[PDB]
C-alpha cells in the first residue's frame, strides 16, 4: 500500500547571446612615401567630409534571453 | 499505506548576455614619410569634417535577461 | 499511514549581463617623418572639426536582469 | 671668385623588422556532445603525451637592423 | 674670393625591431556537454603529460638595432 | 678672402626595439556541462603533469640598441 514519489529534474542548460560588432577592425589609412605633398581643402555651404576617419556605430535592441520554467507536482 | 514525496528539482543553469561593441579596434591613420608637407584647410558656413578621427557609438536597449520560475507541490 | 513531504528545490543558477563598449580601442593618429611641415586651418561660421580625436559614446538602457521565483507547498 | 658649398643630405628612411610568430592561433579541442564518457589512461616507462595542449615555441636570433652612414666633405 | 661652407645633413630616419611571439593566442580546450563523465589517469615511471595546457616559449637573442654614423668636414 | 663654416648637422632619428612575448594570450580550459563527473588521478615515480595550466617563458638576450656617432671639424 506504500507510495514513493521522487521529483528531481536537473537543469544544467547554458543559454548565451553575443550581439553587435564582434569582429576586430584594423584601419591603416595613408602612411605613403612622397617628396613634396600639398593638400588644399576649401569647403563651403553644407559640406560633410571624412578623411581616413573610422566610424563604428552599434545598435542592439535584441540579444535578450528569456527563460520560463514551471514545475507542478499534484498528489490526489 | 505510508506516502513519501521528495521534491528536489535542481537548477544549475547559466544564462549569459554580451551585447554591444565587443571586437577590438585598431586605427593608425597617417604616419607617412614626406620631405615638404603643406596643408591648407579653409572651412566656411556649415562644415562637418573628420580627419583621422575615431568615433565609436554603442546603444544597447536590449541584452536583458528574464528568468521566471514557479514551483508548486499540492497534497490533497 | 504516515506521510513525509521533503521540499528542497536547489537554485545554483548564474545569470550574467555585460552590455556596452566591451572591445579594446587603440587609436594612434599621425607620428610620421617630415622635413618641413606647414598647416593652416581657417575655420569660420558653423564649423565642426575632428582631427585625430577619439569619441566613445555608450548608452545602455538595457542589460538589466529580472528574476521571479515562486514556491508553493499546500497540504489539505 | 667666391665659392659656396651647401651640404644638406636628408635621411627620411624607415627600416622595420617584424620576426617570429606573427599570425593569430585559435585552438578549440574537444567540446562535443556525449551521454556516457569513460576515459582510461595508463602510461608507464618513458611516455610523452599531449592531449588538446598548445605548444608555441619561437626563436629569433635574426631580425636585427644594421645602419652604417658616412658623411665626408673635404675642401682643398 | 670669400668661401662659405654650410654643413647641415639632417637625419629623420626611423629604425624599428619587433621580435618574438607577436600574434594573439586563443586556447579554449574542453567545454563539452556530457551526462556521465569518468576519467581514470594512472601514470608511472618517467611520464610527461600535457592535458589542455598552454606552453608559450620565446627566445630573442636577435632583434637588436645598430647605428653607426660618422661626419667629417676638413678644410685645408 | 673671408671664410664662414657653419657645422649644424641635425639628428631627429628614432631607434626602437620591442622584443619577447608581445601578443595577447587567452586560455579558457574546461567550463563544460556535466551531470556526474568523476576524476581519479594516480601518479607515481617521476611524473610531470600539466592540466589546464599556462606556462609563458620569455628569454631576451638581444633587443639592445647601439648608437655610435662621431663629429670631426678640422681647420688647417
Curated annotation (Swiss-Prot), chains A, B, C, D, E, F:
Tau/MAP repeats lie at residues 3-33, 34-65. Changing residue 34 to M: In FTD1; ultrastructural and biochemical characteristics indistinguishable from Alzheimer disease; accelerates aggregation of tau into filaments. Changing residue 66 to I: In PIDB; 90% reduction in the rate of microtubule assembly. Glycans are attached at residues 44, 50, 66. The modification N6-acetyllysine is found at residues 8, 14, 18, 28, 40, 44, 66. It comes from the Eukaryota. The modification Phosphoserine is found at residues 2, 21, 49, 53. Phosphorylation at serine and threonine residues in S-P or T-P motifs by proline-directed protein kinases (PDPK1, CDK1, CDK5, GSK3, MAPK) (only 2-3 sites per protein in interphase, seven-fold increase in mitosis, and in the form associated with paired helical filaments (PHF-tau)), and at serine residues in K-X-G-S motifs by MAP/microtubule affinity-regulating kinase (MARK1, MARK2, MARK3 or MARK4), causing detachment from microtubules, and their disassembly. Phosphorylation decreases with age. Polyubiquitinated. Requires functional TRAF6 and may provoke SQSTM1-dependent degradation by the proteasome. PHF-tau can be modified by three different forms of polyubiquitination. 'Lys-48'-linked polyubiquitination is the major form, 'Lys-6'-linked and 'Lys-11'-linked polyubiquitination also occur. Expressed in neurons. Isoform PNS-tau is expressed in the peripheral nervous system while the others are expressed in the central nervous system. Coiled coil: none annotated. It is found in: Cytoplasm, Cytosol; Cell membrane; Cytoplasm, Cytoskeleton; Cell projection, Axon. The modification Omega-N-methylarginine is found at residue 46. The modification N6,N6-dimethyllysine is found at residue 8. There is a cross-link at residues 8, 14, 18, 28, 40, 44, 50, 66, 72 (Glycyl lysine isopeptide (Lys-Gly) (interchain with G-Cter in ubiquitin)). The record marks 8, 14, 18, 28, 37, 40, 67, 72 as: Not glycated. Signal peptide: none annotated. It is linked to In Alzheimer disease, the neuronal cytoskeleton in the brain is progressively disrupted and replaced by tangles of paired helical filaments (PHF) and straight filaments, mainly composed of hyperphosphorylated forms of TAU (PHF-TAU or AD P-TAU). O-GlcNAcylation is greatly reduced in Alzheimer disease brain cerebral cortex leading to an increase in TAU/MAPT phosphorylations. Frontotemporal dementia 1: A form of dementia characterized by pathologic finding of frontotemporal lobar degeneration, presenile dementia with behavioral changes, deterioration of cognitive capacities and loss of memory. In some cases, parkinsonian symptoms are prominent. Neuropathological changes include frontotemporal atrophy often associated with atrophy of the basal ganglia, substantia nigra, amygdala. In most cases, protein tau deposits are found in glial cells and/or neurons. The tau/MAP repeat binds to tubulin. Type I isoforms contain 3 repeats while type II isoforms contain 4 repeats. Promotes microtubule assembly and stability, and might be involved in the establishment and maintenance of neuronal polarity. The C-terminus binds axonal microtubules while the N-terminus binds neural plasma membrane components, suggesting that tau functions as a linker protein between both. Axonal polarity is predetermined by TAU/MAPT localization (in the neuronal cell) in the domain of the cell body defined by the centrosome. The short isoforms allow plasticity of the cytoskeleton whereas the longer isoforms may preferentially play a role in its stabilization. Interacts with MARK1, MARK2, MARK3 and MARK4. Interacts with PSMC2 through SQSTM1. Interacts with SQSTM1 when polyubiquitinated. Interacts with FKBP4. Binds to CSNK1D. Interacts with SGK1. Interacts with PIN1. Interacts with LRRK2. Interacts with LRP1, leading to endocytosis; this interaction is reduced in the presence of LRPAP1/RAP. This is Microtubule-associated protein tau. It comes from Homo sapiens.
Amino acid at each position: 500500500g506504500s507510495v514513493q514519489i521522487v521529483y528531481k529534474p536537473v537543469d544544467l542548460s547554458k543559454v548565451t547571446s553575443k550581439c553587435g560588432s564582434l569582429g576586430n577592425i584594423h584601419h591603416k589609412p595613408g602612411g605613403g612615401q612622397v617628396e613634396v605633398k600639398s593638400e588644399k581643402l576649401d569647403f563651403k555651404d553644407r559640406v560633410q567630409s571624412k578623411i581616413g576617419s573610422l566610424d563604428n556605430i552599434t545598435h542592439v535592441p535584441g540579444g535578450g534571453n528569456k527563460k520560463i520554467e514551471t514545475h507542478k507536482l499534484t498528489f490526489r
